[PDB]
Every structure is written in structure tokens, then in C-alpha cells.
Scaffold this active site. Structure first.
Site, PDB file in Angstrom:
ATOM      1  N   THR A   1      -0.423   0.202  -0.322  1.00  0.00           N
ATOM      2  CA  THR A   1      -1.875   0.463  -0.068  1.00  0.00           C
ATOM      3  C   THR A   1      -2.749  -0.199  -1.157  1.00  0.00           C
ATOM      4  OG1 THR A   1      -1.236   2.592   0.949  1.00  0.00           O
ATOM      5  CG2 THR A   1      -3.589   2.315   0.403  1.00  0.00           C
TER       6      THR A   1
ATOM      7  N   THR B   1      -3.380  -0.997   4.232  1.00  0.00           N
ATOM      8  CA  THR B   1      -2.011  -0.749   3.823  1.00  0.00           C
ATOM      9  C   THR B   1      -0.973  -1.336   4.757  1.00  0.00           C
ATOM     10  OG1 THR B   1      -0.449   1.005   3.047  1.00  0.00           O
ATOM     11  CG2 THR B   1      -1.865   1.545   4.943  1.00  0.00           C
ATOM     12  N   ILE B   2       0.145  -1.788   4.174  1.00  0.00           N
ATOM     13  CA  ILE B   2       1.402  -1.999   4.925  1.00  0.00           C
ATOM     14  C   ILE B   2       2.434  -0.845   4.718  1.00  0.00           C
ATOM     15  CG2 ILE B   2       1.127  -4.515   5.101  1.00  0.00           C
ATOM     16  CD1 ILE B   2       3.201  -4.717   2.726  1.00  0.00           C
ATOM     17  N   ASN B   3       1.958   0.261   4.131  1.00  0.00           N
ATOM     18  CA  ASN B   3       2.753   1.459   3.815  1.00  0.00           C
ATOM     19  C   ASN B   3       3.631   1.324   2.571  1.00  0.00           C
ATOM     20  OD1 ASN B   3       3.333   4.138   3.907  1.00  0.00           O
ATOM     21  ND2 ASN B   3       4.979   3.927   5.406  1.00  0.00           N
TER      22      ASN B   3
ATOM     23  N   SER C   1      -2.733   9.473   8.189  1.00  0.00           N
ATOM     24  CA  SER C   1      -2.888   8.733   6.918  1.00  0.00           C
ATOM     25  C   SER C   1      -3.555   9.596   5.846  1.00  0.00           C
ATOM     26  CB  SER C   1      -3.733   7.469   7.119  1.00  0.00           C
ATOM     27  OG  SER C   1      -3.878   6.726   5.902  1.00  0.00           O
ATOM     28  N   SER C   2      -3.177   9.386   4.580  1.00  0.00           N
ATOM     29  CA  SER C   2      -3.844  10.037   3.429  1.00  0.00           C
ATOM     30  C   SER C   2      -5.066   9.262   2.965  1.00  0.00           C
ATOM     31  CB  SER C   2      -2.857  10.204   2.281  1.00  0.00           C
ATOM     32  OG  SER C   2      -1.725  10.924   2.764  1.00  0.00           O
TER      33      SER C   2
ATOM     34  N   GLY D   1      -0.077   6.767  -1.297  1.00  0.00           N
ATOM     35  CA  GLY D   1       0.524   7.759  -0.387  1.00  0.00           C
ATOM     36  C   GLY D   1      -0.254   9.058  -0.349  1.00  0.00           C
TER      37      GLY D   1
HETATM   38 CL   LIG Z   1      -5.408  -0.405  -4.998  1.00  0.00          CL
END
Ligand SMILES: [Cl-]
Ligand SMILES: *[C@@H]1O[C@H](CO)[C@@H](O)[C@H](O)[C@H]1NC(C)=O
Ligand SMILES: *[C@@H]1O[C@H](CO)[C@@H](O)[C@H](O)[C@H]1NC(C)=O
Ligand SMILES: *[C@@H]1O[C@H](CO)[C@@H](O)[C@H](O)[C@H]1NC(C)=O
Ligand SMILES: *[C@@H]1O[C@H](CO)[C@@H](O)[C@H](O)[C@H]1NC(C)=O
Ligand SMILES: *[C@@H]1O[C@H](CO)[C@@H](O)[C@H](O)[C@H]1NC(C)=O
Ligand SMILES: *[C@@H]1O[C@H](CO)[C@@H](O)[C@H](O)[C@H]1NC(C)=O
Ligand SMILES: [Cl-]
Ligand code: NA
Lengths: 189, 342
Positions: free
Chosen positions: A1, A19-21, A71-72, A94
Site C-alpha cells: 500500500t 495498493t497491490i496488497n 479494505s483498511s 494493512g
Molecule cells: Cl505510503
């Protein structure tokens, strides 16, 4: 992220989290296009997977075709009553994104820390499950003590907790900060 | 220098990308232009974190209209996905099956159609150069490379760009992304369409499926970034805070801050160790109450979160939780009433 914050000369603003997680997402890189593919499917709950001792799956966040995973992330813009931007803020990390973002806001808006201190200030995190409170290495140990005497079990984050980029309106203009935990720096004119 | 600026500012997690964002503003771009140019750059310098293979949300505020909006461009599960498709964390974390449908480029395109002032290709230009020329690996990426040394070194296609002499690049060493440069150029020239329904599409599908995934051309053809006209907000003193609702964590942030606002924190809250300690204890308790309710959230198109979110953004609800925060102790998990069904 990654989070980033932008304020333009006209006072318009963008707060964007992307993000790409996980680190390097799925670990699938295209040898032709170079594209590094996300593993965002991992943000869904699965009835078969157990992530943490005694944490059940969340059926509201099960996989469905066409569904987006919980998502967070929470890219935020705070605007004053006069219509002027007061703060542009968000985080990577996360489940720590949401607590870190709350902290950056608390720190600047209530404790009165300037934007750089609001970003750099030690953080802590609790997400209920698991039960523990995680604190950063250089937290005020009077805080650690006040937590433990109140029966929080704490533990120290081996690296750091989240990454925050933020911009705050001040008398002098727009104060900007990038989180040294990851090594960014802001730029402007 | 000091990082206070009289006219405009960009805060990104790589100096060079903040600079790229700033130059865009300077050349007359909107806040959106700058964000996109910077985001494209972050996809390179912090390639472990984000990029065109992922998804994003943008919260956008217009000081003229005084309206805020959100652009939802988070990835979606592919049409062939199902609830029990994974049986181990490994299956949901590694390989093509873990890949959701990337929203990133659609998201940039929607934001740019609505708020762009520079031409689309101009947003890519600086990053195309960066990826061809290479750049020193920064702190964040080097730690990520280190953290993931094993998988990277064992996977020829990642090592191809992320290694030097078959060992992960280290801070200061030069990272070059020649394939991505070419892809960014195609995107700059052909537009978003090239990714979703154009010259990149078939290759994307082939890469994902070769890795054991199930994404199809249809999935890409059908992806849509979404405009959210009424993002979440909460009122905080004389300010309003705009943030995304479910499927993001706006409701969670809202509940945290609404619980904590009733304590009226100030500079005095952290002046003495006695006050500071109570303050932090209270913050941790707000976290716990907020995360208890989080487990009810999901994609609002697939799960009804209307009342859950109503509670989480309600100040009265927050005051009810604030009232159960004991100043002298934390509590067991059940105390906070985590829920997995409404
Ligand atoms: Cl960042
Ligand atoms: C996991 O198990 C389910 C139920 O038998 C099956 O449909 C699915 O194909 C399996 N998936 C993986 C990734 O092993
Ligand atoms: C904000 O809205 C006004 C009026 O509709 C428009 O003219 C202006 O370009 C917009 N600005 C940004 C930065 O989006
Ligand atoms: C492009 O879009 C059209 C209409 O959605 C579709 O039928 C066509 O097959 C797509 N082409 C590619 C290369 O994905
Ligand atoms: C906050 O959201 C609510 C619910 O949609 C709405 O009444 C209001 O327009 C929003 N407030 C602001 C200040 O934009
Ligand atoms: C919202 O909160 C009220 C109490 O204030 C409670 O009765 C109700 O169960 C809650 N609704 C949901 C969906 O949690
Ligand atoms: C969680 O931590 C709290 C605080 O020490 C404690 O009271 C409780 O027993 C722990 N376990 C559970 C299951 O809540
Ligand atoms: Cl590449
Ligand atoms: Na700074």
C-alpha cells in the site's frame, strides 16, 4: 500500500491510497508487460481459512464474483467551515492504516503537534483480535506503563507501525510531511 | 528544506514522486493530474506497494464547488471467483488465483476525465523516463526486498528486475524497469482502453492464467471505476472529514474519532504522565470498540451495511461506547461485542 496527499494552488485537494496488497502482491510479474499483479483476493474472508487463533471468518467479507474485498484504507480530507482544506491524510500498512490515520489526526488536531511531528510521533495499535496492543520501539514508556497497569498486554513492533503522508494548512501556507519510516519526502512551491 | 510551501504541496513516500507531482502542479495540472503523475511514479519507486496491477481509492475535494467526491477503483473478484475457492492462506496470497481485477488505470482515467487539466500522456512522461533510466533503490523498497529476499531470488521473473547477480537489490543500487516503461508508454499513447480492452488485455489475461488464475478478457472489459458523489463524512468541531465508506474503513475511522471527541482532548491531555497515560489508554479502548464493529463491513453492493454504517457514524452510538470505556482497565474481547452477523 502507498498513501499520498496533494493540495493544489487553488486549494483543491486529493488524498489517495493505492495498493497491490502484500509486498510484491501475488508475486506474479508479467515477463512481457512488467505488470506486477495484486493479491487483493487475500483481503476477502474465506470460510475455510483460519488466520488467527480463535478468529472466525467474517461472512460479510466472503468472496463473490464482482465483489470488492473489505479494505483498511481510508484516504481522508478535512475541510474547515470556511470551505478551505485543513488536512489531507491517510496511511499504508494493512489493518494499521485506520488506527495510524486516526493517530495522525488526533496528534495534529487535538494534541497540537505540527504535521511533521504528527507523522513522526510514535504510534500504537490494537485491533481487538488479536487481543494484544502493539507499540512502536520509541514510544513514551510512561504510556507503556499506563497501558500495562491497566491490564493491556503490550508488545513492541519489530519494525514500525504504518506509513503516513499528510498536509496541514498553517499560517505560513501548506505544511507537508512524509513518513521517515519509509523514507519519502514532500515537494512543493 | 522545511516542507512548508506558500502555494502547493505533494506528500508522497518517495521524494522523486513528490517532485513529479509538484512539477505537474507547476505546469498547470489539477490536484488530480499531480496525484496521477505521482501515483505512476510510486508504482515504480515503491513497486512492492502499489501500481497499475492493483487498485485505489481517491478522495477529492474541490475548493470552488466546495464538494468532495470519492472515486472507487479498488479491484473486484473475477466473474469466475466463488466463496470457497481457497483452502489455505498460501492459495489466497501467492499465484494467479490470488489476483483480483486491477482497477488502477480505470481509476486514474475516471479522475482525469472529471478533473484533469494536463493531457493524459503528460502524466506518464516523467515515469517513462524514470523506469528506462533506472533509479537508486530507496529505503522502503530495500527493506521490502530484504523482507522478501527468498521468494524474489527463487522466482526468475521477479529476480529479472529485482536482483543484481541473483541477489535482491540493496538500498542505493540501481533499479531499472524496462518492461513497465514500455507499458506506461502504451498507456500514455493508447489510453486506459489499452489495459482493459485493447493492446495489453490478452497478455494480461495470459499472464494471470499462466500463473494459475482465472481472470478473463471479459473481467477486464467489464471493470468500471465508480464515482461516489456523497462520500462519508463526520463533523469534528468546526471541520468536516470526508473519507470513503464501505468497502473501505471510513466507518471505522469515524467511530474511533467520534468516541474520542467526547473526551475533548487537547494539549493538556499529554502534558503530564498521568494525563498522557489515560489518554493513550482511552485511544486504545476506542480502537477496540471500533474494530469490534468492523467485522460487519463488506462491499455494500453485496451486503447490506446501511444500519451498521449508520451506527458507526452516529455520535450517540459513539457516546454509548465511550460510556463503557473504563478509565482504570481494559476488558476481554466479548466486552466490546464483536459481531459476525447483524
Ligand atoms: Cl505510503
Ligand atoms: C478448495 O476446496 C474447494 C472445496 O472442495 C474447491 O472447490 C477448490 O477448488 C479448492 N481450491 C484450492 C485453491 O485448492
Ligand atoms: C471545481 O469545480 C469548478 C466549478 O464546477 C471547476 O470549474 C473547477 O475546475 C474544479 N476544480 C477542480 C480542481 O477540480
Ligand atoms: C473490446 O471491447 C469490446 C466491447 O466490450 C469487446 O467485445 C472486445 O472483444 C474487446 N477487445 C479486447 C481486445 O478485449
Ligand atoms: C455528510 O453526509 C451526510 C449523509 O449523506 C449528509 O447529510 C451531508 O451532506 C454530509 N455533510 C457534509 C458537510 O458534506
Ligand atoms: C445500532 O445500535 C443500536 C443501539 O444504539 C442497536 O440497537 C442496534 O443493534 C444497532 N444496529 C446494528 C445493525 O448494529
Ligand atoms: C484480552 O486481554 C484482556 C486484557 O488483559 C484480558 O482481560 C482478557 O482476558 C484477554 N482475553 C480475551 C479472550 O479477551
Ligand atoms: Cl519492468
Ligand atoms: Na516535513
Amino acid at each position: 500500500t502507498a498513501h499520498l496527499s496533494v493540495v493544489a494552488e487553488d486549494g483543491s485537494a486529493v488524498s489517495a491510497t493505492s495498493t497491490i496488497n502484500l509486498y510484491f502482491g501475488s508475486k506474479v510479474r508479467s515477463p512481457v508487460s512488467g505488470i506486477l499483479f495484486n493479491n487483493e483476493m487475500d483481503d476477502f474472508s474465506s470460510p475455510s481459512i483460519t488466520n488467527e487463533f480463535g478468529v472466525p471468518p467474517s461472512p460479510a467479507n466472503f468472496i463473490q464474483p464482482g465483489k470488492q474485498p473489505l479494505s483498511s484504507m481510508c484516504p481522508t480530507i478535512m475541510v474547515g467551515q470556511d470551505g478551505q482544506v485543513r488536512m489531507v491524510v491517510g496511511a499504508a500498512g494493512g489493518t494499521q492504516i485506520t488506527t495510524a490515520t486516526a493517530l495522525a489526526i488526533i496528534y495534529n488536531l487535538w494534541f497540537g503537534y505540527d504535521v511533521k511531528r504528527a507523522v513522526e510521533e510514535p504510534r500504537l495499535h490494537n485491533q481487538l483480535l488479536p487481543n494484544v496492543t502493539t507499540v512502536e520501539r520509541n514510544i513514551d514508556q510512561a504510556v507503556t506503563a499506563a497501558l500495562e497497569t491497566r491490564h493491556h498486554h503490550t508488545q513492541i513492533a519489530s519494525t514500525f507501525i504504518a506509513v503516513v503522508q499528510a498536509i496541514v494548512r498553517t499560517a505560513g501556507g501548506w505544511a507537508a510531511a512524509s513518513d521517515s519510516r519509509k523514507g519519502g519526502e514532500p515537494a512543493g512551491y | 528544506d522545511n516542507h512548508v510551501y506558500t502555494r502547493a504541496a505533494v506528500a508522497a513516500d518517495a521524494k522523486q514522486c513528490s517532485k513529479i507531482g509538484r512539477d505537474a502542479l507547476r505546469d498547470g495540472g489539477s490536484a488530480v493530474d499531480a496525484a496521477i503523475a505521482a501515483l505512476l511514479c510510486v508504482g515504480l519507486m515503491n513497486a512492492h506497494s502499489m501500481g497499475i496491477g492493483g487498485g485505489l481509492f481517491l478522495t477529492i475535494y474541490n475548493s470552488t464547488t466546495r464538494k468532495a467526491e470519492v472515486i472507487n477503483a479498488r479491484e473486484v473478484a473475477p466473474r469466475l471467483a466463488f466463496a470457497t475457492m481457497f483452502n489455505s492462506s498460501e492459495q489466497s496470497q501467492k499465484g494467479g488465483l490470488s489476483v483480483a481485477v486491477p482497477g488502477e488505470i480505470r481509476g486514474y482515467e475516471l479522475a482525469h476525465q472529471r478533473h484533469g487539466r494536463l493531457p493524459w500522456a503528460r502524466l506518464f512522461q516523467p515515469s517513462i523516463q524514470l523506469a528506462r533510466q533506472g533509479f537508486p533503490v530507496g529505503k522502503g523498497l530495500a527493506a521490502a526486498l530484504e523482507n522478501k529476499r527468498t521468494v524474489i531470488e527463487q522466482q526468475p521473473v521477479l529476480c529479472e528486475v529485482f536482483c543484481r547477480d541473483r541477489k535482491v537489490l540493496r538500498e542505493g543500487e540501481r533499479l531499472t524497469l524496462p518492461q513497465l516503461a514500455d507499458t506506461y508508454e502504451t498507456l500514455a499513447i493508447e489510453g486506459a482502453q489499452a489495459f482493459y480492452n485493447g493492446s495489453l488485455t490478452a497478455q494480461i489475461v495470459k499472464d494471470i492464467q499462466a500463473a494459475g488464475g482465472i481472470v478473463t478478457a471479459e473481467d477486464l472489459n467489464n471493470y468500471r471505476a465508480e464515482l461516489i458523489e456523497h462520500p462519508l463524512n463526520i463533523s469534528l468541531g468546526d471541520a468536516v472529514l470526508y473519507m470513503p465508506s464501505a468497502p473501505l474503513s471510513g466507518p471505522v475511522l469515524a467511530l474511533i474519532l467520534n468516541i474520542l471527541k467526547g473526551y475533548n482532548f487537547s494539549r493538556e491531555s499529554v502534558e503530564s504522565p498521568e494525563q498522557k497515560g489515560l489518554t493513550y489508554h482511552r485511544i486504545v479502548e476506542a480502537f477496540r470498540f471500533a474494530y469490534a464493529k468492523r467485522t460487519l463491513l463488506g462491499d455494500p453492493k453485496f451486503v447490506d451495511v446501511t444500519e451498521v454504517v449508520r451506527n458507526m457514524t452516529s455520535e450517540f452510538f459513539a457516546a454509548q461506547l465511550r460510556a463503557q470505556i473504563s478509565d482504570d482497565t481494559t476488558h476481554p474481547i466479548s466486552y466490546y461485542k464483536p459481531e459476525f452477523y447483524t
